[PDB]
Amino acid sequence: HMTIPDKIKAVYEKSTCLYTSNEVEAALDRMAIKIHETLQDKNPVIICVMVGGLVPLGNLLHRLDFPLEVDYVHATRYRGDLTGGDILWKVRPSSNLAGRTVLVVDDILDGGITLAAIINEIKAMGAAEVYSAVLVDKYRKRVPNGLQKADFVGLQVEDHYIFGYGMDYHEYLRNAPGIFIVHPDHEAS
Amino acid sequence: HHMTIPDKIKAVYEKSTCLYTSNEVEAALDRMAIKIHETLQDKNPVIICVMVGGLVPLGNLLHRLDFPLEVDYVHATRYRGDLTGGDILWKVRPSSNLAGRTVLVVDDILDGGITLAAIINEIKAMGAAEVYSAVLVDKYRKRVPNGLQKADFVGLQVEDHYIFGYGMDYHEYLRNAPGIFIVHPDHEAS
Asked: Boundaries of each Phosphoribosyltransferase domain copy (chain A) (predicted)?
């Protein structure tokens, strides 16, 4: 029968490139400058939001020229859970975050209900300050209970079906070198 | 108000010696990527990050890998006294979905690799068809019983220095240093 990797190849092959890898790297440079201005003297814990935060965070980290520690967190949500109150935790924020400045890093702000719950849970562990960073923000789309603004944003995009540079298409294509839009043939509407 | 940990961190970084520049590291990642492609492009691998050291090397490596793959992560710790790897503490375990899959395990450094070998063996025990190992740096002259004996993919071979950077920490700091650095003997005596 038809194979998942063959279908992935077809999706990628038919996709359209919204941003090159170079443009993405350039957006990471801009973020880094801003993050430095805000955080350099704050000894932050930088927390990767799994799994999507991993590519952006790893590429951002060596651009940040100040003392910092790294950690990670993992939460999922049912789409039907509109409040963020039924969140499924796989990896919880640690007690070590008490009194710390924390920067939370994710691939994309898309509503951000789940990102807001993660942030609030970090606050509940006693963090002094929580900032948010996102490689891409779907800037026109905001939802109740969602995160209204990220502190640091690489790229602002319209509401497309997108993948790459940490963003998956059914777990695949996080390794695509840029930001891509799924072809209308493969957009299940 | 006394000297803080971050102040000492700055001093360590300031006195450290640069072993490899960021450019040399990126070039090593390019070489690893080519090797990984030749061996794995047709294998539909799950690429697993060994937390937390794997995160920067993996993130940088990922967008160089031009073939279908999935990403996951694992986390395990060890007492220095546990020379066997029989008593490792799991924080995040390999999943049962790895059954029948080709898996590539990515960590920052092969330094003995006792924990790394235990992780690999545990992935085999969940039924993975094949396990490969990739490491940004290998302390190629240091091998220990129960440790990983050889990695399939190695970015850079180094001597047994106190090193940090590019995902390797010095007491949880300095994973963000842009290159590979050696700690000055005034901060770390042998």
From this structure: 19-168
Q: Does A54 touch chain B (CB under 8 A)?
A: yes
Q: Mention every residue, 6+ apart, whose C-beta is less than 8 A from residue A136.
A: A107, A108, A109, A153, A154, A155, A156, A157, A162, A167, A179
- Residues of B annotated as catalytic are 111
Instruction: Give, in words, the CATH class of B1-190.
Output: alpha beta
What are phi and psi for residue A44, nearest 5 degrees? -70, 150
Domain regions of chain A by residue span: 1-189
In degrees, rounded to 5, the angle at the alpha carbon of residue A48 between the alpha carbons of residues A33 and A97 is 95
Q: Nearest Cβ partner of A50 from B73, B91, B175?
A: B73
Q: Say if the Cβ atoms of B167 and A58 lie within 8 Å.
A: yes
Place of tokens 């006792």: B114
| A175 vs B69, B169, B172: nearest CB | B69
In Å, how far from its chain's centre is CA A155? 12
Q: Would you call B60 and A59 a contact, using CB atoms and an 8 Å cutoff?
A: yes
Candidate CATH numbers 3.40.50.720, 3.40.50.300, 3.40.50.2020, 3.30.420.40; the one for domain A1-189: 3.40.50.2020
**A5 CB within 8 Å of a chain B CB:** yes
- CB-based contact, A151 to chain B, within 8 Å: no
The experimental method is X-ray
A92 touches chain B (CB under 8 A): no
What SS3 state is found at B141? coil
Cβ <8 Å between A62 and B178: yes
Q: Could you say which DSSP state residue B186 is in?
A: T
